[PDB]
């Protein structure tokens, strides 16, 4: 998977991403407030899920934003 805000943003801005999962409780919300609008401007399917802690557990880190 592609992890990290910068790499995920680049993958969205190209057409490389096939789906994007976004955590719903990021602390400064401005880090991801604009992400659904961008995924909708492109045609990238996306979902908003419950915990950045659960995303981090999935990928092997403490947390993850997307």
């Amino acid at each position: 998977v592609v992890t990290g805000l910068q790499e995920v943003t680049r993958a969205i801005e190209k057409k490389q991403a096939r789906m994007v999962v976004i955590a719903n409780n990021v602390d400064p919300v401005e880090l991801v407030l604009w992400m659904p609008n961008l995924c909708r401007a492109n045609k990238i399917p996306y979902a908003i899920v419950k915990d950045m802690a659960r995303l981090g557990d999935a990928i092997g880190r403490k947390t993850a934003t997307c």
Partner: peptide, 22 residues
């Protein structure tokens, strides 16, 4: 990168969402 989105967003301090957050 993501910097441009954060910069352009923080240049809108008088919008409804930014006012709510502040």
């Amino acid at each position: 990168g993501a910097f441009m989105y954060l910069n352009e967003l923080w240049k809108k301090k008088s919008s409804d969402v930014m006012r709510f957050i502040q």
